[PDB]
Coordinates of C-alpha atoms (C1' of nucleotides) and ligand atoms in Angstrom, one line a residue:
Chain A
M1 CA 6.7 -7.6 18.1
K2 CA 7.7 -11.0 19.0
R3 CA 6.9 -13.4 16.2
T4 CA 6.2 -17.0 16.5
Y5 CA 8.6 -19.4 15.1
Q6 CA 11.3 -19.1 17.8
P7 CA 13.3 -22.3 17.7
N8 CA 14.8 -24.6 20.3
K9 CA 16.5 -28.0 19.7
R10 CA 15.0 -29.7 22.7
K11 CA 11.2 -28.6 22.0
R12 CA 11.4 -29.8 18.3
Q13 CA 12.2 -33.2 19.5
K14 CA 10.1 -33.4 22.7
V15 CA 7.1 -32.4 20.9
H16 CA 7.5 -33.4 17.1
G17 CA 10.2 -36.1 17.6
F18 CA 10.3 -39.8 17.1
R19 CA 9.7 -41.2 20.7
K20 CA 6.6 -39.0 21.1
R21 CA 5.2 -40.6 18.0
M22 CA 6.1 -44.2 19.1
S23 CA 4.5 -43.9 22.6
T24 CA 1.0 -43.7 21.4
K25 CA -1.4 -45.5 19.0
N26 CA -1.9 -42.3 17.2
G27 CA 1.7 -41.5 16.5
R28 CA 1.8 -44.9 14.9
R29 CA -1.1 -43.8 12.7
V30 CA 1.0 -40.7 11.7
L31 CA 4.1 -42.7 10.9
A32 CA 2.3 -45.5 9.0
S33 CA 0.4 -42.8 7.1
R34 CA 3.5 -41.1 6.0
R35 CA 5.1 -44.4 5.1
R36 CA 2.4 -44.9 2.6
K37 CA 3.4 -41.9 0.7
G38 CA 7.0 -42.9 1.5
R39 CA 8.3 -39.5 2.4
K40 CA 11.9 -39.1 3.4
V41 CA 11.7 -37.4 6.7
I42 CA 9.4 -39.5 8.7
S43 CA 9.4 -37.0 11.6
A44 CA 11.4 -34.1 12.9
Chain B
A1 CA -6.1 7.9 -10.1
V2 CA -6.2 4.9 -12.5
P3 CA -5.7 4.8 -16.2
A4 CA -9.1 4.3 -17.9
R5 CA -8.0 2.6 -21.1
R6 CA -5.2 1.1 -23.1
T7 CA -3.5 3.8 -25.1
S8 CA -3.1 2.5 -28.7
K9 CA 0.0 2.0 -30.7
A10 CA -0.4 5.5 -32.2
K11 CA -0.2 7.4 -29.0
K12 CA 2.8 5.4 -28.1
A13 CA 4.7 7.1 -31.0
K14 CA 3.0 10.5 -30.8
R15 CA 4.5 11.2 -27.4
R16 CA 8.0 10.0 -28.2
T17 CA 8.9 12.6 -30.8
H18 CA 10.6 14.6 -28.1
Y19 CA 12.6 11.7 -26.7
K20 CA 15.7 11.9 -28.8
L21 CA 19.5 12.1 -28.1
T22 CA 21.1 14.8 -30.0
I23 CA 24.8 15.9 -30.3
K24 CA 26.1 19.4 -29.9
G25 CA 29.1 21.1 -31.4
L26 CA 31.9 18.9 -32.9
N27 CA 34.9 21.0 -34.1
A28 CA 38.0 19.6 -35.7
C29 CA 41.3 19.9 -34.3
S30 CA 44.5 21.7 -35.4
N31 CA 47.1 19.1 -34.7
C32 CA 45.2 16.1 -35.7
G33 CA 42.1 17.3 -37.5
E34 CA 40.0 14.9 -35.4
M35 CA 36.4 15.6 -34.5
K36 CA 36.4 16.9 -30.8
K37 CA 34.3 19.0 -28.7
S38 CA 34.3 22.8 -28.8
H39 CA 36.0 24.6 -25.9
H40 CA 37.2 21.3 -24.5
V41 CA 40.7 19.7 -24.2
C42 CA 41.4 17.5 -27.0
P43 CA 41.9 14.1 -25.4
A44 CA 43.9 12.0 -27.9
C45 CA 45.8 15.2 -29.0
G46 CA 46.5 16.3 -25.5
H47 CA 46.5 20.0 -26.8
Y48 CA 44.5 23.0 -26.4
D49 CA 45.5 26.3 -28.1
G50 CA 48.4 24.3 -29.4
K51 CA 50.0 23.6 -26.0
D52 CA 51.0 20.3 -24.2
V53 CA 48.5 20.9 -21.5
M54 CA 47.7 17.3 -20.3
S55 CA 51.3 16.6 -19.7
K56 CA 54.2 17.2 -17.4
Chain C
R1 CA 26.7 32.0 -4.0
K2 CA 26.3 28.3 -5.1
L3 CA 24.6 26.1 -2.6
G4 CA 26.1 22.7 -2.7
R5 CA 25.3 21.0 0.6
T6 CA 24.3 22.2 4.0
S7 CA 25.9 25.3 5.7
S8 CA 29.0 24.0 7.6
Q9 CA 29.7 21.3 5.0
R10 CA 30.6 23.8 2.3
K11 CA 33.2 25.2 4.8
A12 CA 34.5 21.6 5.2
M13 CA 34.4 21.1 1.4
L14 CA 36.3 24.3 0.6
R15 CA 38.8 24.0 3.3
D16 CA 39.4 20.5 1.9
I17 CA 39.9 21.5 -1.8
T18 CA 41.7 24.8 -1.2
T19 CA 44.2 23.4 1.2
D20 CA 44.9 21.3 -1.9
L21 CA 46.5 23.2 -4.8
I22 CA 48.7 24.6 -2.3
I23 CA 50.4 21.3 -2.2
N24 CA 49.9 19.9 -5.6
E25 CA 48.9 22.7 -8.0
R26 CA 46.7 20.4 -10.1
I27 CA 43.3 19.2 -9.1
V28 CA 40.7 17.2 -11.0
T29 CA 37.1 17.8 -9.9
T30 CA 33.7 18.8 -11.2
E31 CA 32.7 22.2 -12.6
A32 CA 30.9 24.1 -9.8
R33 CA 33.4 23.1 -7.2
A34 CA 36.2 24.7 -9.2
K35 CA 34.3 28.0 -9.4
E36 CA 34.1 28.2 -5.7
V37 CA 37.8 27.2 -5.4
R38 CA 38.6 30.0 -7.9
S39 CA 37.3 32.5 -5.5
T40 CA 38.5 31.2 -2.2
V41 CA 42.1 30.5 -3.4
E42 CA 42.6 33.8 -5.0
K43 CA 41.2 35.5 -1.8
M44 CA 43.8 33.4 0.0
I45 CA 46.9 34.3 -2.0
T46 CA 46.4 38.0 -1.6
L47 CA 47.2 37.3 2.1
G48 CA 50.4 35.8 0.8
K49 CA 51.5 39.1 -0.5
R50 CA 51.3 40.9 2.9
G51 CA 53.3 38.8 5.3
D52 CA 52.0 40.5 8.5
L53 CA 50.6 38.9 11.6
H54 CA 47.1 39.5 10.0
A55 CA 48.3 37.6 7.1
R56 CA 49.0 34.6 9.3
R57 CA 46.2 35.3 11.7
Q58 CA 43.6 35.4 9.0
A59 CA 45.1 32.2 7.4
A60 CA 44.0 30.4 10.5
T61 CA 40.7 29.7 8.7
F62 CA 41.3 28.0 5.4
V63 CA 44.5 26.2 6.3
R64 CA 44.5 22.7 7.6
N65 CA 47.0 22.6 10.4
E66 CA 49.0 19.4 10.3
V67 CA 49.4 19.0 6.6
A68 CA 52.9 18.6 5.2
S69 CA 54.7 18.9 2.0
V70 CA 58.4 18.2 1.6
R71 CA 60.9 18.7 -1.0
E72 CA 63.6 19.6 1.5
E73 CA 66.6 18.8 3.6
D74 CA 70.1 20.2 4.2
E75 CA 71.2 17.5 6.7
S76 CA 67.9 16.9 8.5
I77 CA 64.3 16.0 7.9
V78 CA 62.8 19.6 7.6
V79 CA 59.1 20.0 6.7
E80 CA 57.1 22.7 5.1
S81 CA 53.6 22.8 6.5
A82 CA 51.4 24.1 3.6
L83 CA 51.0 27.6 5.1
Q84 CA 54.7 28.3 5.2
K85 CA 54.4 27.5 1.5
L86 CA 52.1 30.4 1.1
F87 CA 54.3 32.8 3.0
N88 CA 57.5 31.6 1.4
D89 CA 56.8 30.5 -2.1
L90 CA 53.5 31.5 -3.7
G91 CA 53.8 35.1 -2.4
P92 CA 57.0 35.8 -4.2
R93 CA 55.8 33.9 -7.3
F94 CA 52.9 36.2 -7.9
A95 CA 54.6 39.2 -6.3
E96 CA 54.3 41.0 -9.6
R97 CA 51.0 39.4 -10.9
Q98 CA 47.6 41.2 -10.5
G99 CA 44.4 39.2 -10.0
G100 CA 43.6 36.1 -12.0
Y101 CA 46.1 33.4 -10.7
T102 CA 44.2 30.4 -12.1
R103 CA 43.2 28.3 -15.1
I104 CA 40.1 26.0 -15.5
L105 CA 40.0 23.5 -18.3
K106 CA 37.2 21.4 -19.6
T107 CA 38.0 17.6 -20.2
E108 CA 35.4 15.0 -20.1
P109 CA 32.2 13.8 -18.3
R110 CA 32.9 11.3 -15.6
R111 CA 32.0 7.7 -16.3
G112 CA 29.9 7.0 -13.2
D113 CA 27.5 9.9 -13.1
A114 CA 28.1 12.0 -16.4
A115 CA 29.4 14.8 -14.2
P116 CA 31.7 17.0 -16.4
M117 CA 35.2 17.3 -14.9
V118 CA 37.8 20.0 -14.7
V119 CA 41.5 20.6 -14.2
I120 CA 42.7 23.6 -12.1
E121 CA 46.2 25.0 -12.4
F122 CA 47.9 28.3 -11.4
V123 CA 50.1 29.9 -14.0
Chain D
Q1 CA 31.8 -10.1 -55.7
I2 CA 30.2 -9.0 -52.4
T3 CA 30.4 -5.8 -50.3
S4 CA 28.6 -5.1 -46.9
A5 CA 30.1 -7.3 -44.3
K6 CA 28.2 -7.9 -41.2
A7 CA 28.7 -8.0 -37.4
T8 CA 26.3 -8.7 -34.4
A9 CA 26.4 -8.9 -30.7
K10 CA 23.7 -11.2 -29.1
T11 CA 22.0 -11.0 -25.7
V12 CA 23.8 -7.7 -24.8
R13 CA 22.5 -6.8 -21.3
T14 CA 21.0 -3.4 -22.0
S15 CA 17.4 -2.4 -22.4
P16 CA 16.1 -2.4 -26.0
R17 CA 14.3 1.0 -25.8
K18 CA 17.5 2.9 -24.7
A19 CA 19.7 1.4 -27.3
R20 CA 17.4 2.5 -30.1
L21 CA 18.2 6.1 -29.0
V22 CA 21.8 6.0 -30.1
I23 CA 21.1 4.1 -33.4
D24 CA 19.0 7.1 -34.4
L25 CA 22.3 8.9 -34.7
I26 CA 24.2 6.5 -36.9
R27 CA 21.9 5.5 -39.8
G28 CA 23.1 6.8 -43.2
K29 CA 26.5 8.3 -42.3
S30 CA 30.0 7.5 -43.2
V31 CA 32.0 5.1 -40.9
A32 CA 34.9 7.4 -40.1
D33 CA 32.7 10.0 -38.7
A34 CA 30.2 7.9 -36.9
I35 CA 32.9 6.4 -34.6
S36 CA 33.8 10.0 -33.5
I37 CA 30.0 10.5 -33.0
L38 CA 29.8 7.5 -30.8
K39 CA 32.7 8.5 -28.6
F40 CA 31.1 11.5 -26.9
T41 CA 27.6 10.3 -25.9
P42 CA 27.7 9.3 -22.2
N43 CA 25.5 6.2 -22.3
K44 CA 25.9 2.5 -21.6
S45 CA 24.7 1.9 -25.1
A46 CA 27.6 4.1 -26.4
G47 CA 30.4 1.7 -25.5
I48 CA 29.0 -1.2 -27.3
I49 CA 28.0 -0.1 -30.7
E50 CA 31.7 1.1 -30.9
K51 CA 32.8 -2.6 -30.6
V52 CA 30.2 -3.6 -33.1
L53 CA 31.4 -1.1 -35.8
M54 CA 35.0 -1.9 -35.1
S55 CA 34.4 -5.6 -35.7
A56 CA 32.5 -4.9 -38.8
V57 CA 35.4 -2.8 -40.1
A58 CA 37.8 -5.6 -39.2
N59 CA 35.5 -8.1 -41.0
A60 CA 35.4 -5.9 -44.2
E61 CA 39.3 -5.6 -44.1
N62 CA 40.3 -9.2 -43.3
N63 CA 37.7 -10.9 -45.3
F64 CA 36.4 -9.0 -48.5
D65 CA 36.8 -5.2 -49.0
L66 CA 39.3 -2.6 -49.4
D67 CA 38.8 1.3 -48.9
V68 CA 38.2 1.8 -45.3
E69 CA 37.6 5.5 -46.0
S70 CA 34.8 4.6 -48.4
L71 CA 32.3 2.8 -46.1
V72 CA 28.8 3.8 -45.3
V73 CA 26.7 2.6 -42.2
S74 CA 23.6 1.5 -44.3
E75 CA 21.6 -0.7 -41.9
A76 CA 21.4 -1.1 -38.1
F77 CA 19.0 -3.0 -36.0
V78 CA 17.8 -3.3 -32.4
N79 CA 15.9 -6.5 -31.5
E80 CA 14.7 -7.9 -28.2
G81 CA 16.6 -10.8 -26.7
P82 CA 15.2 -13.1 -23.9
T83 CA 14.3 -11.6 -20.6
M84 CA 15.2 -12.6 -17.2
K85 CA 12.4 -12.5 -14.6
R86 CA 12.8 -11.7 -10.7
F87 CA 10.7 -10.5 -8.0
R88 CA 10.9 -7.8 -5.3
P89 CA 9.3 -7.7 -1.8
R90 CA 6.9 -5.0 -1.8
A91 CA 5.2 -3.8 1.4
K92 CA 2.1 -5.3 3.0
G93 CA 3.1 -8.9 2.3
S94 CA 2.7 -9.2 -1.4
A95 CA 5.3 -9.0 -4.2
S96 CA 5.6 -7.5 -7.7
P97 CA 7.8 -8.8 -10.5
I98 CA 10.7 -7.1 -12.2
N99 CA 11.7 -7.8 -15.7
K100 CA 15.3 -7.7 -16.8
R101 CA 15.8 -7.3 -20.6
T102 CA 18.4 -8.0 -23.2
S103 CA 18.9 -6.9 -26.9
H104 CA 20.4 -8.2 -30.1
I105 CA 22.4 -5.5 -32.1
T106 CA 23.5 -5.8 -35.7
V107 CA 25.2 -3.2 -38.0
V108 CA 25.8 -3.6 -41.7
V109 CA 28.6 -1.6 -43.4
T110 CA 28.3 -1.2 -47.2
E111 CA 30.9 0.6 -49.2
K112 CA 28.8 3.2 -51.2
Chain E
rG1 C1' 3.4 -16.0 -23.1
rU2 C1' 3.1 -10.7 -24.0
rA3 C1' 1.6 -5.8 -23.7
rU4 C1' -0.7 -0.4 -21.5
rG5 C1' 0.5 2.7 -17.2
rA6 C1' 6.2 4.5 -18.6
rG7 C1' 11.5 5.0 -19.3
rU8 C1' 6.9 7.3 -14.5
rA9 C1' 7.0 6.2 -8.9
rG10 C1' 10.9 4.3 -6.1
rC11 C1' 16.6 3.2 -5.2
rG12 C1' 14.9 1.5 2.5
rA13 C1' 17.1 7.8 8.3
rA14 C1' 23.9 9.5 8.4
rA15 C1' 29.9 13.7 5.7
rG16 C1' 33.4 13.5 2.8
rA17 C1' 37.7 15.6 -0.4
rC18 C1' 42.3 15.0 -2.9
rA19 C1' 47.0 12.5 -4.3
rG20 C1' 49.3 7.5 -5.8
rG21 C1' 48.3 2.5 -6.9
rU22 C1' 46.2 -2.0 -9.8
rG23 C1' 43.4 -2.7 -14.2
rA24 C1' 40.6 -3.4 -21.0
rG25 C1' 37.7 -0.2 -18.0
rA26 C1' 37.1 3.2 -11.8
rA27 C1' 33.1 8.5 -7.4
rU28 C1' 31.9 3.1 -5.7
rC29 C1' 38.6 -2.0 -4.8
rC30 C1' 43.6 -1.0 -2.3
rU31 C1' 47.3 2.6 0.3
rG32 C1' 48.3 7.6 2.4
rU33 C1' 46.6 12.4 4.4
rC34 C1' 43.1 15.5 6.9
rC35 C1' 38.0 16.1 8.1
rA36 C1' 33.5 13.9 10.5
rC37 C1' 29.9 10.4 13.8
rC38 C1' 28.8 7.0 18.6
rG39 C1' 31.3 6.3 23.0
rU40 C1' 25.8 2.8 29.6
rA41 C1' 27.5 2.4 23.1
rU42 C1' 27.6 2.0 16.5
rG43 C1' 33.4 -0.7 22.3
rA44 C1' 34.7 -6.0 24.9
rC45 C1' 33.1 -11.0 26.5
rU46 C1' 29.4 -14.8 26.3
rA47 C1' 24.0 -18.0 26.5
rA48 C1' 20.5 -19.7 22.8
rG49 C1' 20.0 -19.7 17.5
rG50 C1' 22.1 -20.3 12.7
rU51 C1' 25.3 -24.6 10.4
rU52 C1' 31.1 -23.6 7.2
rU53 C1' 29.3 -18.0 6.1
rC54 C1' 36.0 -18.6 9.0
rC55 C1' 41.5 -18.7 6.7
rU56 C1' 44.7 -18.9 1.8
rG57 C1' 44.8 -18.3 -3.5
rG58 C1' 42.1 -17.4 -8.1
rG59 C1' 37.0 -15.7 -10.9
rG60 C1' 32.9 -12.0 -12.8
rA61 C1' 27.2 -15.5 -16.3
rA62 C1' 23.6 -14.8 -12.1
rG63 C1' 22.7 -12.5 -6.6
rG64 C1' 24.5 -6.9 -4.4
rC65 C1' 17.8 -2.1 -5.3
rU66 C1' 23.4 1.8 -9.7
rC67 C1' 28.8 0.6 -10.5
rG68 C1' 32.3 -3.2 -9.2
rU69 C1' 39.0 -5.5 -10.6
rC70 C1' 35.2 -6.3 -4.6
rC71 C1' 32.0 -9.6 -1.1
rG72 C1' 28.6 -13.0 3.9
rC73 C1' 28.5 -14.7 -4.1
rC74 C1' 31.3 -18.7 -7.5
rC75 C1' 35.8 -22.4 -8.0
rA76 C1' 39.9 -25.0 -5.6
rG77 C1' 42.5 -26.2 -1.3
rG78 C1' 42.6 -26.1 4.6
rG79 C1' 41.6 -25.1 9.5
rU80 C1' 37.6 -26.5 15.2
Chain F
rU1 C1' -2.2 -28.7 -20.4
rA2 C1' -3.4 -35.8 -22.6
rG3 C1' -2.0 -40.6 -19.6
rU4 C1' -0.5 -42.0 -12.4
rG5 C1' 0.8 -36.2 -9.0
rA6 C1' 5.5 -38.0 -11.5
rA7 C1' 8.0 -40.6 -19.2
rC8 C1' 13.3 -36.2 -17.0
rC9 C1' 17.4 -38.6 -9.9
rA10 C1' 9.0 -37.1 -7.7
rG11 C1' 6.1 -37.6 -3.0
rU12 C1' 11.8 -34.5 -5.1
rA13 C1' 12.5 -28.9 -5.0
rC14 C1' 8.9 -25.3 -2.4
rC15 C1' 5.3 -23.9 1.7
rG16 C1' 3.3 -24.6 7.4
rU17 C1' 6.0 -25.5 14.6
rG18 C1' 2.8 -29.6 13.1
rA19 C1' -0.9 -33.3 11.1
rG20 C1' -0.6 -31.8 6.2
rG21 C1' -0.5 -29.5 1.0
rG22 C1' 2.6 -30.0 -3.7
rA23 C1' 4.4 -28.3 -8.6
rA24 C1' 7.4 -27.2 -13.5
rA25 C1' 10.6 -30.0 -16.7
rG26 C1' 10.3 -35.2 -23.4
rG27 C1' 12.7 -34.4 -29.3
rU28 C1' 20.3 -32.1 -32.9
rG29 C1' 22.0 -35.7 -36.7
rA30 C1' 22.1 -41.6 -39.9
rA31 C1' 27.1 -41.2 -37.3
rA32 C1' 29.6 -36.3 -32.7
rA33 C1' 32.0 -36.5 -37.6
rG34 C1' 29.9 -31.1 -31.5
rC35 C1' 33.3 -26.1 -35.9
rA36 C1' 41.4 -27.5 -36.7
rC37 C1' 43.2 -22.7 -38.3
rC38 C1' 42.7 -17.2 -39.2
rC39 C1' 40.3 -12.3 -38.0
rC40 C1' 37.7 -7.9 -33.9
rG41 C1' 37.1 -8.0 -28.6
rG42 C1' 39.0 -8.6 -21.5
rA43 C1' 35.5 -12.0 -22.5
rA44 C1' 30.7 -13.0 -24.0
rG45 C1' 29.5 -12.8 -29.1
rG46 C1' 30.2 -12.7 -34.3
rG47 C1' 32.8 -13.1 -39.7
rG48 C1' 35.7 -16.3 -42.9
rA49 C1' 37.6 -21.4 -43.8
rG50 C1' 36.0 -26.5 -42.7
rU51 C1' 32.4 -31.2 -41.1
rG52 C1' 27.7 -32.6 -43.0
rA53 C1' 22.5 -34.1 -48.3
rA54 C1' 21.0 -29.9 -45.2
rA55 C1' 24.1 -25.2 -40.2
rU56 C1' 17.8 -20.2 -41.0
rA57 C1' 19.9 -28.9 -38.0
rG58 C1' 25.5 -25.1 -33.7
rA59 C1' 24.1 -27.9 -28.2
rU60 C1' 17.8 -22.7 -25.3
rC61 C1' 19.9 -27.6 -30.9
rC62 C1' 13.1 -31.4 -35.7
rU63 C1' 8.6 -28.2 -37.9
rG64 C1' 8.2 -23.1 -35.5
rA65 C1' 1.4 -20.1 -35.7
rA66 C1' -0.6 -15.7 -32.7
rA67 C1' -0.4 -11.5 -29.4
rC68 C1' 4.1 -8.3 -28.9
rC69 C1' 8.8 -5.4 -30.7
rG70 C1' 11.6 -3.7 -34.9
rU71 C1' 13.8 -2.2 -40.5
rG72 C1' 12.9 -0.7 -45.4
rU73 C1' 9.4 1.1 -48.9
rG74 C1' 4.3 2.0 -53.2
rC75 C1' -0.1 5.8 -51.7
rC76 C1' -2.3 9.4 -48.1
rU77 C1' -1.9 13.0 -44.2
rA78 C1' -0.8 20.1 -40.4
rC79 C1' -9.1 24.7 -41.0
rA80 C1' -10.0 19.3 -38.4
rA81 C1' -15.3 16.8 -34.3
Chain G
rU1 C1' 5.4 47.6 -63.9
rU2 C1' 0.6 47.9 -61.4
rA3 C1' -4.1 45.8 -59.8
rA4 C1' -7.9 41.6 -59.3
rG5 C1' -8.4 36.3 -59.0
rU6 C1' -6.9 31.2 -59.0
rG7 C1' -3.7 28.3 -56.4
rA8 C1' 0.7 22.9 -56.6
rA9 C1' 5.3 21.0 -54.1
rU10 C1' 7.7 19.3 -49.6
rA11 C1' 6.3 15.6 -43.2
rA12 C1' 8.9 17.0 -36.6
rG13 C1' 5.7 12.6 -36.8
rG14 C1' 1.6 9.2 -38.1
rG15 C1' -2.0 5.4 -41.2
rC16 C1' -2.8 1.5 -44.8
rG17 C1' -0.4 -2.4 -48.2
rC18 C1' 3.9 -5.4 -49.2
rA19 C1' 8.7 -7.6 -47.9
rC20 C1' 12.6 -9.3 -44.2
rG21 C1' 13.9 -10.2 -39.2
rG22 C1' 13.5 -11.0 -33.3
rU23 C1' 11.1 -12.8 -28.9
rG24 C1' 7.3 -17.4 -27.8
rG25 C1' 6.4 -22.4 -28.1
rA26 C1' 0.6 -23.7 -30.7
rU27 C1' 0.4 -27.3 -34.2
rG28 C1' 2.2 -31.9 -37.5
rC29 C1' 4.9 -36.5 -36.7
rC30 C1' 7.2 -39.7 -32.7
rU31 C1' 7.8 -42.9 -27.8
rU32 C1' 11.5 -44.3 -23.4
rG33 C1' 5.7 -44.1 -19.5
rG34 C1' 0.8 -44.9 -18.1
rC35 C1' -4.7 -46.9 -18.1
rA36 C1' -8.3 -51.0 -18.3
rC37 C1' -8.4 -56.1 -18.4
rU38 C1' -7.4 -61.6 -19.9
rA39 C1' -4.9 -66.7 -18.7
rG40 C1' -1.6 -68.9 -15.3
rG41 C1' 1.4 -68.5 -10.3
rA42 C1' 1.3 -66.8 -5.4
rG43 C1' -1.7 -64.9 -1.1
rC44 C1' 2.1 -63.7 4.3
rC45 C1' 7.1 -61.7 6.9
rG46 C1' 8.6 -62.0 12.0
rA47 C1' 13.1 -63.2 19.2
rU48 C1' 17.5 -67.9 14.6
rG49 C1' 15.4 -60.3 15.3
rA50 C1' 10.7 -58.2 10.5
rA51 C1' 8.7 -53.9 7.1
rG52 C1' 11.3 -49.3 6.7
rG53 C1' 15.7 -46.8 7.3
rA54 C1' 20.9 -44.2 9.2
rC55 C1' 26.1 -44.8 8.1
rG56 C1' 29.9 -46.7 5.1
rG57 C1' 32.6 -49.7 0.3
rG58 C1' 35.4 -48.0 -5.7
rA59 C1' 42.0 -45.1 -8.3
rC60 C1' 39.7 -40.2 -8.7
rU61 C1' 33.4 -40.0 -5.9
rA62 C1' 28.7 -34.9 -5.5
rA63 C1' 24.3 -38.0 -6.8
rC64 C1' 21.3 -42.8 -8.3
rA65 C1' 21.9 -48.1 -8.4
rC66 C1' 24.3 -52.7 -5.9
rC67 C1' 26.5 -54.3 -1.6
rG68 C1' 27.8 -54.6 3.9
rA69 C1' 34.4 -54.4 8.0
rU70 C1' 34.4 -61.2 3.8
rA71 C1' 31.5 -54.1 1.5
rU72 C1' 31.1 -52.0 -6.7
rG73 C1' 31.7 -58.3 -3.7
rC74 C1' 33.4 -64.4 -1.9
rU75 C1' 32.1 -70.6 -2.7
rU76 C1' 29.7 -74.5 -5.6
rU77 C1' 26.6 -76.8 -9.6
rG78 C1' 24.6 -76.1 -14.6
rG79 C1' 24.5 -72.6 -19.1
rG80 C1' 27.8 -69.6 -22.8
rG81 C1' 32.3 -68.7 -26.0
Ligands
LIG201 ZN1 43.7 18.3 -31.7

RNA sequence: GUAUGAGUAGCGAAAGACAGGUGAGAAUCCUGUCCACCGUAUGACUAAGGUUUCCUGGGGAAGGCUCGUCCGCCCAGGGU
RNA sequence: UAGUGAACCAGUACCGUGAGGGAAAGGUGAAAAGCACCCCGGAAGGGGAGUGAAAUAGAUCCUGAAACCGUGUGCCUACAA
RNA sequence: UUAAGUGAAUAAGGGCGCACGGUGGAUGCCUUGGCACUAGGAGCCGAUGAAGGACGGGACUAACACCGAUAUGCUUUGGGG
């Protein structure tokens, strides 16, 4: 009966962070796609 | 099961003729003449059979 | 009888309420609890008339042990223990009375549950 | 020259079906008996129409009328106020709403 | 947006009773008494996780599956 | 309910770990002059007295339809498929 | 007086017509925002540190805007009363 969304603080930022969306050319697509809508939280 | 139809406005009211509130026996006191329940201690009077009962 | 709860819980209920009225002589409860307390209190004052060892050693059921009631000193702190009150006060009060040591009066329904409420006294 | 003072109480947090039960028992009677009638019914809608009649009596005294012993409850209403709306988590994932209702209550006290 | 079903089903495993408080109001808040339940845990300390819920004083429109003078709720200060 | 998704503190609240998806919400009066004071009630809420041309324009504030819920009354209704 | 026969009236509740209220915001009027274009300008910013942001600044400060330890702003040249 374990359910999914079992949080850490490390894993949120070493998967969905900032540096692992700056170290590609696809994380930059993600960031420059969110900046078009101009959402507040760019990434977690 | 499942109700087959909307019941109309008439059969709302034809049920509810036995959904009343009624009030039973209301005597009047001796020491105040105020309308209070039979066989019960008269609360504002504090008396029953002419005695300071509710005192403590 | 009147079932109110499970089996042993009625013994707990009536030892609770009938070791009261020995101490206070007024009680405010519901209707049906008052009728069971009628029967059990008047069965436990007729032991207060005898004064034997069987009067004591049948009062070991419906008497809570460590229960005090004090209007008392000479030069001391001396304590009646709510069974001593039966075998010293309520016996000689109704030494000449026959049965029927109680009154039940009908006051009001309770605000929370519309349960009608009731006063018990002795004399 | 006018009789028949008014008194209301708006958005009372009681359901409008249940409060029409009590107002069955008041329409057409004298004022001085209907208060005694209200004091023995054990309902939530009992201890509100008391306050409505007492404010209506105070209006008829301090504004217009005389003769408290000669007042008749002639009219009494129940209308529906606005409703709150909330939900409840019902089993197997879904949810079903819950209404919460309110009523407006008026009572008119003529003389005779 | 509003009906019908309908003032129906349900109110999410348990033991409470009395006296005295406070209060516009009390089964449901506070105090006392006895009774009862677990006790390799319904007791103690901590790692994550939550992010001010903690403490002090006030409040009752909404939340609390009823009530509520009470709260892990609201107002105002303050503690790491 | 149109016109950008958005006339209003909107890519906001909300939802999914994530890339992503995404709402609802305009109007008192010319002027706030937004009801001093009295009365019932713990308050909420109302009734007088006032402001205002108008308060059934009282802050959910222009006009205010329909379903739906009530009150009062002219006529009918307990041998009827 | 007896006998035969004929039989009205009332409503626990309900239906229709009228009249007055309550919830709810269609419709009438309005515009603080959009849509599609016209004519002209302009068609790059950046290691002298960019676009986009985090944190802070007011007497009180939760938010928006403006600003940046010289922080709700400083110097100079023209306008204006
Ligand atoms: Zn009396």
